[PDB]
Design a protein around this nucleic acid. Sequence first.
RNA 1: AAGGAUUGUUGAUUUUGUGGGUGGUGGUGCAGUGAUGCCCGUUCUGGACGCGCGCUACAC
Lengths: 259, 237
Amino acid sequence: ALPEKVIKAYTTVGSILKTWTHGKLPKLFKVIPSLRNWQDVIYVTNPEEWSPHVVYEATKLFVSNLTAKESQKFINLILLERFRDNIETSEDHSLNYHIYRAVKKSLYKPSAFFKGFLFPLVETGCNVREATIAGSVLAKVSVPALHSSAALSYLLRLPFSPPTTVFIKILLDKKYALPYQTVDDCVYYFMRFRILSNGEDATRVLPVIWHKAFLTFAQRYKNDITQDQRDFLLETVRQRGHKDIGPEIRRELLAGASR
Amino acid sequence: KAEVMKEVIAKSKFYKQERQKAQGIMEDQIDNLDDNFEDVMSELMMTQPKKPKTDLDKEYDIKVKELQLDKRAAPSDRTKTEEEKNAEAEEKKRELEQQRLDRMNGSISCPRTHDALLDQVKKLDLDDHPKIVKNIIKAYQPKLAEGNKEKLGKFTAVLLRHIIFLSNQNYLKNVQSFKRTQNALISILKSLSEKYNRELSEECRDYINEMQARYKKNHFDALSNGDLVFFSIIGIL
RNA sequence: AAGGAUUGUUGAUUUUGUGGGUGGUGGUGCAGUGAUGCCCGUUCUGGACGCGCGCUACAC
């Protein structure tokens, strides 16, 4: 229970943020990041009621001032929920221009962004449209190779889902200097769909989004795999290869030299 | 049509005034809020509350440290097919030939001076010059440090004078090794020219001006064997 | 460069130099899916009336 004077003051802030489009934000709003109990203060400001312009500014103010751990709650509790809500409720299932920027500012802190936006989304029923919009934000904005590799490593172990494949391929599309550990994990991920005892992943139908992802790995990291790993991947194409993409992958895999 | 437009213009102006009126009300609320900032802040501080990571969060932090330990792989580009490479090569050749037709129609120390290179290579044999000059380029690549482009650019002028300088020196004793150096140095100069042709061009003209000035006093005695070499190198580069 | 590169107080997200790819939250027609045929943004500010007489210039 915040002070009654404070509640009325921030209740005015909640009204301010609903229609705010430009200018200077309220001074009380700008000092919320310093406050320990921001959760109570932010709630009375009605984050769901924030205008798209406010959401963009709020991510800038809060991601910058705050610790890494707290910023995760913001990206998870507010930005992520707003990101899903706008896509679901929009007529064309598109994301607003300001919210689109807000995700980029969250990516300013990679560790908070991945554990607050990416991993919660893919693990909470992400849809293809959500992955495409979020993936493009990941595609255009710069990320460290170390942080990207950890995110790429995390995605692989998760059970195969269409949203998970989109995020994996984009990270592969970034042309990163993946650690030698990360390359092996990517190789293991693609092996698990080859028929052998094995799980359903061997027999599960594979969309092209898997094949496109696998082609990108072959195109860029053919020189970063061992000869034995190349053999397992080649067997995977023989068993699960696509009609048109599969021949291309085999050409790329065979063209790479063994580490 | 005009009546509809006037309604449209009136509606746009009407909404514009409403947005301005809201903005006029908007700033006043901020101004009042800012004035009461101290009172709101004071109560909030008095009510400040008194003083485990998820298993997912713990794993991710562990992964980052482990990934830092491991070595990093270099990323490669997709291999282009032979037909695409041939098509790209043909297009570049077709482009380059066309512009030519239009023009027809109208530890290791980098020596900033030619003398410095001799001091570095003074104790080395004649056949060792390609080794030393190549090392200087590797030791001072553009990426290694800032200003290496300028140092390499100056070295291009230095290397050119060296090629001409060696030709002036007598070499009938060991023509074979001397042949093994001039072509080797020239090949390096060709690579250097591709990046520092501006620097090479400036040095070449000055030699021409120097060439003229020495001809203005000595006639044929100024002319030398390396002078013939110099005109040849320009043709290559 | 952690004994501190960069951020609106923050911490390796950036800064300097050298290399370097891509139209891609594209749209639309077909059979969620498709190596898919075809093409190729954001907020403010403003929107000398006619006839007619006479006279005067324009021609080596």
